[model samples]
Target: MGHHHHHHSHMANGAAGTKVALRKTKQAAEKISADKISKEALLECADLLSSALTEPVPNSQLVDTGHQLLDYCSGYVDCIPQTRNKFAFREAVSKLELSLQELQVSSAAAGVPGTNPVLNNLLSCVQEISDVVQR
Candidate 1:
């Protein structure tokens, strides 16, 4: 819970390139089937990540995938109940939003960033997992 996900978040030399980096980071996140937290939102996000990885992007699904991933995360934060535990939700939401804002992109001319789209949801999943741990 020490913000470890983003620690490996930097564009990697391990993967040696962006797409490879994306694939590596994503595969790492894909393995997160921890028995610790049982939040429906987190489970749904994990399912989303798995399905997104399984489905062929076909270039068209690129934007759709990113948007869908971000949408689920937004909804997850929105659904957090207003109570004493709400601070936990607030931190998760903040981390996710900040990351998303930093990750957003729009440029067919210059081309897309290697890991931005996938990283958006990947980091959100991390935040969700960490948030549950904080509780």
Candidate 2:
């Protein structure tokens, strides 16, 4: 078995190197821009957040809704495009991040560990979005 592995070292090295270079160049060409940001997704997140805050939802349901909201926000920020409104989006996302943190803190203070785990995870995800928006 070991003997078979030693046969094509030279050919493997060049093929692997070329493939890696090609992949890198291809990736570099596919950059994200602000125009690609979907306002519809952002609106959906707003509605989700508003409903979560206003409704008498259970902890488990809140956590489930939060997971979906966080994912939407994450994707929204990931492709932050270059535009005059970039700063506005950045501020908005920062506020959202803070709001999530407040919810997590309040839940923890209320002795509710049921929502803490998902809330904590959601906070981290929102923070990443905040960072991406600011970048």
Candidate 3:
């Protein structure tokens, strides 16, 4: 699962823009349905992404969205039981943590060379996701 940026200059260009996100969301919804994450949760998440895309400040709102998305991902990870496959769980947790951490280089840097509020959450989400993945 390669990280998707969902932006380019001013959130434009083909860099994992809304189209990609929508597709990803569709896939996520399908997985959620399969995993029995609750139709309510799925619908709420779908609505959240849809609402975010329709707005003008996608970057500004990204932190909050990342938090919400992290919460949802944690729920998914939690459903996998320790009794079933704890070793694999640990491995997956490490991989997941690394995957999210890999986003740090881009996240910590300013959106552009001199810009502010990069709105990056790779590091933050890594922490959030890792905590859940380990649990």
Candidate 4:
């Protein structure tokens, strides 16, 4: 009658098997531009913005990404060196900023964030800024 000697074996699962992929879309905002803005940097930013908008990123993500774009462009304008098209470049960046702000509002409201019309306009604005930067 010594049947009470049965030990329950607890198998420990390896927690190392819970690995997951944490990679995300490459963020262009992570690359810092030189102290002074360059056409190359502006073009890269525009290309990344275009890619991000084209992808099926969530509206919340778009808002944060747009903020980064705005910050980068603002920094460009802030430290811009003297050039013949300085005012024009500033104007373009300002317009881009406005569009980004609109996008942020729309995203927050869950309104036209997914609409192509606004998205196209924003992309065009980015292109405009890129063109200005190149000039």
lDDT of 4 by residue, 1-135 (tens): 455765567576576745434323333545644344665766786787777777766666655665565656666765557665567666766776777767766664454445646677767777777776676
Listed in order, each prediction's TM-score against the native is: 0.35, 0.41, 0.29, 0.56
Pairing residues by index, what is the TM-score of model 3?
Answer: 0.29
Off by over 4 Å in 1: 1-42, 50-84, 106-134
Candidate 2: which pairs clash? 33-81, 34-81
List RMSD in Å for every model shown.
16.0, 12.7, 14.9, 13.6
Compose the digit string of candidate 3's lDDT tens values, residues 11-122: 4357565455554344564565446665356346635544543444434353355445544554564555664444544444454344333433444432332222222223
Worst 10 residues of 3 by lDDT: 112-121
Clashes of each: 0, 2, 0, 0
What TM-score, to 2 decimals, does candidate 2 have?
0.41
lDDT of 1 by residue, 1-135 (tens): 576565755674564464444433223424633322245645565555445444543323444444444444444544456554555665655555454444444323223334345455644545464455356
Model 2 accuracy (lDDT, Cα): 0.51
The candidate that wins on lDDT is 4
Which 10 residues in a row give candidate 1 its minimum summed lDDT? 106-115
lDDT of candidate model 4 versus the reference: 0.64
After superposing candidate 3 on the true structure, give the runs of residues whose Cα lies further than 4 Å from its correct spot: 1-39, 78-135
lDDT tens per residue, model 2, 1-135: 567667754663446555455432224323633334465665555556455544555554554565455445544654547754455555555555555656645664443443444454444445444444445
